[PDB]
Amino acid sequence: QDMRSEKRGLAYGYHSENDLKAMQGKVKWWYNWDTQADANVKENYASYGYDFVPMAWDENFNEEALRSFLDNHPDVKYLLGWNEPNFMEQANLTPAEAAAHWPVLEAIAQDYNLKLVAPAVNYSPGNVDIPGTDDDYDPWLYLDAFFEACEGCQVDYIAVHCYMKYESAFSWYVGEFERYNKPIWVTEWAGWDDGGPANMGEQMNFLSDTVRWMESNDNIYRYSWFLGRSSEGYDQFPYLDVLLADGELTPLGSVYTSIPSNDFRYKIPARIEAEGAHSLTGFKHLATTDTTGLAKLIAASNEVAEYKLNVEEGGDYTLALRLASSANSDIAIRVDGLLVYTFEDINTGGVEAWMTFSSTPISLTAGDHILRVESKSSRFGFNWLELTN
Ligand SMILES: [Mg+2]
């Protein structure tokens, strides 16, 4: 398949080569808050299609290690600036200070032909004084003061952190940063504040809502989920982990890496994870215990899933669905809006009893097509689909 997302990255510092291969061609870049790539992948990450974005975490970073790493990786194209300088417990730099030290990063960007990402901000506890305001917590008041102190400074991108749990809050809050007229990097996000996700499925729904919004926002240059693996583990609140055992994904990690960009098109024959729909009405996410697929979509009613196909060899394909359904369930299949097959009285006897149901052949001409999977007032689980010729 083509590269699944050009924007999608990951925040994690302990990749193995097997971890990078598990996500290959579904994750484009990553960063680790440090000046060089993870030790076990430093030599080979570029061969799996990734680019690594180094970071100057605060003003006292190790410039020698960063310049030395850059010397041997001319594939590096971007440099992240200070990390949460408006937080006391992080980089702890008032706007003037962060601009004062910015030439160190420009000199680096000049020597290696790099682009510079602004210091990452978020609503802060307010303990780094911004001049001329009492609202020291304010990420926009911080960046304004930064930019006014940084006259003539090379700043190519904005970096944003966000831990809101509501996808509409998230899109409103990240959109506020489009005011600066620069592409945006959401370099840390997950649903976490105000109680966060009630369960793993809530986090997967929130990841899906916000990933889909960012893939459709042209002003978002890049995003990276927080984070590859957590100290607490993937089934502990707030269910952050994208990677499970070496070289394998969590259910959430399957949703994260499967969601396609606007222009990506699936080639066939292929198996396509259900969580890789270009478009979801109503469908929700859960872990599955099926032997493959990691995550399922769940239907209670009339939910719709659409899959955008680049059919290179027109002809008749059989469509297979991997389903679970306690009772009788009906599923309509459409191509560019017109019914072609209906799965009737699907019944596996349990919500985690899985079977593969095949259709009669469906004619799929060469070109661009929307494959639509509609629940027909049915209650079932949907792991992946397969088209074969
Ligand atoms: Mg799946």
Residue numbers in the entry: 85 to 473
Paper text:
Our previous work revealed a curdlan-specific endo-β-1,3-glucanase, CBM6E, from a marine bacterium Saccharophagus degradans 2-40T, which contains an N-terminal GH128 module and a C-terminal CBM6 module. CBM6E exhibits catalytic activity at intermediate temperatures and efficiently produces GOS with DPs of 3–6 from curdlan. The CBM6 module of CBM6E (CBM6E-CBM6) exhibits a strong binding affinity specifically to curdlan, effectively enhancing the enzyme’s activity against curdlan. The GH128 and CBM6 modules form a cohesive structural entity, jointly recognizing triple-helical β-1,3-glucans.
The crystal structure of CBM6E was determined at a resolution of 2.4 Å. The structure of CBM6E comprises two distinct domains: an (α/β)-barrel catalytic domain (residues 84–348) belonging to the GH128 family, and a C-terminal β-sandwich domain (residues 349–473) belonging to the CBM6 family. The CBM6 domain forms an interdomain interface with GH128 primarily through hydrogen bonds between α8 and α9 of the GH128 domain and β10 and β13 of the CBM6 domain. Using the ConSurf web server, we identified that most of the residues at the interdomain interface are evolutionarily conserved. Notably, we observed a Mg2+ ion within CBM6E-CBM6, occupying a similar position as seen in ZgLamCCBM6. This ion demonstrated an six-coordinate octahedral geometry and coordinated with Glu357 OE1, Glu359 OE1, Ala379 O, Asn467 OD, Asn467 O, and a water molecule. To identify ancillary binding sites for curdlan triple helices, we conducted molecular docking experiments using a triple-helical β-1,3-glucan undecamer and the apo structure of CBM6E. In Model 1, the triple-helical β-1,3-glucan displayed a favorable structural complementarity with the CBM6 domain, while its nonreducing ends made contact with the GH128 domain. Model 2 revealed the triple-helical β-1,3-glucan spanning across the active groove of the GH128 domain. Overall, both docking models, in conjunction with the crystal structure of CBM6E in complex with GOS, support the hypothesis that triple-helical curdlan unwinding precedes its hydrolysis within the catalytic groove.
